[PDB]
A paper describes a structure:
To characterize the molecular interactions that distinguish these various [name]-containing complexes we set out to identify the [name] binding site on [name]. We show that the [name] binding site on [name] (the “SSMS site”), distinguishes [name] from cyclin E and is distinct but overlapping with the [name] binding site for p27. The structure shows that the insertion has not affected the overall fold and the kcat/Km values for each complex towards this substrate were comparable. Moreover, compared to wild type [name], cyclin Amut5 has a reduced interaction with SKP1, CKS1 and [name]. These results demonstrate that the SSMS site makes a significant contribution to the stability of the pentameric [name]-[name]-CKS1-SKP1-[name] complex in a cellular setting.
The SCFSKP2 ubiquitin ligase relieves G1 checkpoint control of [name]-cyclin complexes by promoting [name] degradation. Cell cycle transition from G1 to S phase is tightly regulated by the sequential activation of [name] by cyclin E and then by [name]. p27 is both a [name] inhibitor and a [name] substrate and the balance of these activities ensures appropriate cell cycle progression.
Numbering used by the authors:
A (entry chain A): 28 to 35, 41 to 294
B (entry chain B): 175 to 432
C (entry chain C): 29 to 36, 43 to 295
D (entry chain D): 175, 177 to 432
Write the structure that this text describes.
């Protein structure tokens, strides 16, 4: 009986059309369940399974101790499984952030809020610019590139991984140009060697400052060699070399994963 | 290549078998015909061109129209254009960055329909399709097959898209064939016309379709191509005259396949 | 937003529950937010409430529900009931599983499935309705007429059950239920209840029990609390206290709104 | 007696909301008051066959009137299916053991199938929006009776008889509230059996004088005088029985003053 209920001059909005049609094809333990759709002339309801709390409220209630490392490993393993299932079913999510990730009491975590999702092609065309919440937005989008696809979702998960470990947002920018500079200060200013084609993209400029790359032992003190290795592969500048959700599942970091209860 | 292209193709091949209307549904529809449907789709092509909409958006709208007319009984001829307008509005909302306003879909129908009548038809189409709007198209399969051209040939791509577009017009016979099969036949026929080549071996392993298994659909498409200058509906031939499409609709079709 | 939600010709229980609940707008009655009807499914959308009184009582087995909170809960329940009876509605299935509580200190009547509108005066209605433990003696003795009094009886059972943390009258069958009531309140006769000897399922054979002092039945209650309970468990349903008059009992002179755990 | 007064106040509030428009029939193009009279007459016969309560019949008639006030074009061939569903709904609301859906088919003589009755049920519930707890003439009568102590059974049955006669004739009874017809019906019953008038206690309770009841009392006196000649006769048949004390056999009074 206990469920979560979404209650929706241009008729049915495009966000709802996309949310329902995509979410009803996705059946996976780590994707929130759409139980039912209630459709009349006057009103339209989405009935979702009830989940205890979002990851943002859990991180805030855990802020003194942080989330134990084993539970961070469990949550990232599950989120990569759900994301891999999305990308296997031609779905980009495009708004991964802690408020859209829901947890139960038994130790599970699930992707939710598919309102800004869309079905992608093989190969991809140009899609809507300036997607994803600023703090979790990948450099491809900031720099205004013709094409983006699955990689933008892996960027967002990398920002969320670091945020679970440090207990603060990794790149908390105030504007597009402030977000870019905060990214460049931690990972270094990109160039043609590490990211071929970067100086050709529409919103790049040669006047950008050149910061050296920082050791990840300073960006993420609590993590071991394997965790730093995975985070740096999820935050690769070139979206062609950024690790996939599927390949990330097989990383040495997950070779001792358990399922602890929050 | 990305480690999910294989998976996406397998998943589309599974789902194309499900979003299915019946061959000759039009015989159980007493006030409308294949000819009235041919006129409707040729008009949607023009609407596509006027508002600079994507080819994917036209392919989805046609899918929505055939599934709707397969389910609802006694759709009257004074409503057939309103079904079409609602299908293109939904496909626009699903697939486009900047969909035209409701006011634009009223304006292209020159005030035959009110805004309230177009929103009621949108509600009705969504109820009949149960929000299953993410349908596989010929366009989606062609786009995947085009990657097996090395190097990339955009003249072949343009003829392939033109032939797939011609197949939307004629319910008899193209309702008999799955989108994956119509894409296969269109790609081979464009390849053979422009380049002299055939359905490649890399696509025989990927799809599981031999040249022999494509032959029924390929013989129907060859006749559509030969006969296209004489067809009553001419909006697709005019669209693919443009330099954007390398003027492929002006090319001489091959007189024989073998 | 989080909701309680019910799905499923269309059943008599749903016709009664929807038609009656949508007239009952009161802070101590579960809010029916919306009703969506299709040619296939019928949806009842209710406000979300934390947990039922039965689950709170078990989770409070260590300390028992403290008295200030018991007084608050009974006060609010009687306000909701008073409201029901005043818009000619009988609940007829009051038990701890059908009383829902929030974190902020509120309690509310829920599940109007077995409910119905009553005329003034009342006819014979459904032969036996309330769950055995909470069922009034007039129903067990099979009287033609029952009314508002059966809801006050059920509530009196819930009052004692909060205070002692166990069912007052937990009987197995209809004749076992009476013998458990008769043990505590004494065997009724023509004096206390003018009628009993007439009524269809009464027998002269019925055994005798002398009345037990409420000092033992519900020990931790003060004089005022014991007075209110005997006025809610009175045998004759014409003389049993109403929800309205119960709100004016001196037990409530010092009522407040405590927050649960 | 402390709920009796609050319930009468509440019922008086809701009888103005659970209302149809008087001039609904002239807008309903394929139906007349005449046809309505024949259908309400038929449901009485149904009531008797399945020993249904009088309240059930009063509720069904309320649902039928409100449904024809809302829906635009009811074909006369559908009018009996509307009635079958209205009575099914009322039985589910009000009866302990409501007759089965198969039973409600059996009485149409297979005019309409099961599918069609469940379909018409749904349409009625959507139109009324589950607002099925309507005040009736019966509910108001039942309250007035408590002011004759001890009860006079002959007055009660004759008041119920006269209230049930009001259900047949849309013209004129649609332009009177249930509470008013109950007042007119009780005073008419009381005067024919005992010679007594609308009592002081029910004037204090309702705030209705006998002047205020006059328009309705004079319409109900005429229906009662010429009930012997009416085309519909199921109600008179009903109330000849000893269950209702044979009150339809009583001669009406010639004058009221």
């Amino acid at each position: 009986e206990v469920v979560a209920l979404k209650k929706i001059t241009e008729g049915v909005p495009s966000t709802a059309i996309r949310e329902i049609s995509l979410l009803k094809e996705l059946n996976h333990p780590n994707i929130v369940k759409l139980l039912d759709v209630i459709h009349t002339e006057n009103k339209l309801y989405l009935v979702f399974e009830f989940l205890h709390q979002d990851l943002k409220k859990f991180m805030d209630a855990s802020a003194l101790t942080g989330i134990p490392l084993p539970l961070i490993k469990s949550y990232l393993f599950q989120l990569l499984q759900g994301l891999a299932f999305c990308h296997s079913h031609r779905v980009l999510h495009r708004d991964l952030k802690p408020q859209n990730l829901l947890i139960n009491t038994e130790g599970a975590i699930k992707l939710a809020d598919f309102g800004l999702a869309r079905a992608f092609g093989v190969p991809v065309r140009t899609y809507t610019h300036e997607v994803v919440t600023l703090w979790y937005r990948a450099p491809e989008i900031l720099l205004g590139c013709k094409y983006y696809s699955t990689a933008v979702d892996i960027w967002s998960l990398g920002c969320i991984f670091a945020e679970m470990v440090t207990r603060r947002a990794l790149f908390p920018g105030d504007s597009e140009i402030d977000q870019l500079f905060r990214i460049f200060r931690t990972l270094g200013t990109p160039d043609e060697v590490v990211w071929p084609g970067v100086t050709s993209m529409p919103d790049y400029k040669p006047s950008f400052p050149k910061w050296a790359r920082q050791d990840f032992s300073k960006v993420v003190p609590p993590l071991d060699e394997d965790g730093r290795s995975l985070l740096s592969q999820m935050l690769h500048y070139d979206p062609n070399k950024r690790i996939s959700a599927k390949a990330a599942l097989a990383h040495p970091f997950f070779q001792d994963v358990t399922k602890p209860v929050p | 290549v990305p480690d999910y292209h294989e998976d996406i193709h397998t998943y589309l091949r599974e789902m194309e078998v499900k979003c299915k209307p019946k061959v000759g549904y039009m015989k159980k529809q007493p006030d409308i015909t294949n000819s009235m449907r041919a006129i409707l789709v040729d008009w949607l092509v023009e609407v596509g061109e006027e508002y600079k909409l994507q080819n994917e958006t036209l392919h989805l709208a046609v899918n929505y129209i055939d599934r709707f007319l397969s389910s609802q009984e006694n759709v009257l001829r004074g409503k057939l254009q309103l079904v079409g307008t609602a299908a293109m509005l939904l496909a626009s909302k699903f697939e486009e960055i900047y969909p035209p306003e409701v006011a634009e879909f009223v304006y292209i129908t020159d005030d035959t329909y009110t805004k309230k009548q177009v929103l009621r038809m949108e509600h009705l189409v969504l109820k009949v399709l149960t929000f299953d709007l993410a349908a596989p198209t010929v366009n989606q399969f062609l786009t995947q097959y085009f990657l097996h051209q090395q190097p990339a040939n955009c003249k072949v791509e343009s003829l392939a898209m033109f032939l797939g577009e011609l197949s939307l017009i004629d319910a008899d016979p193209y309702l008999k064939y799955l989108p994956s099969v119509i894409a296969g036949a269109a790609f081979h026929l464009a390849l053979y016309t422009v380049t002299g080549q055939s359905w490649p071996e890399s696509l025989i392993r990927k799809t599981g379709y031999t040249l022999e298994s494509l032959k029924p659909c390929l013989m129907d498409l060859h006749q559509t191509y030969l006969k296209a200058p004489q067809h009553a509906q001419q909006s697709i031939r005019e669209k693919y005259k443009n330099s954007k499409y390398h003027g492929v609709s002006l090319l001489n079709p091959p007189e024989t396949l073998n």
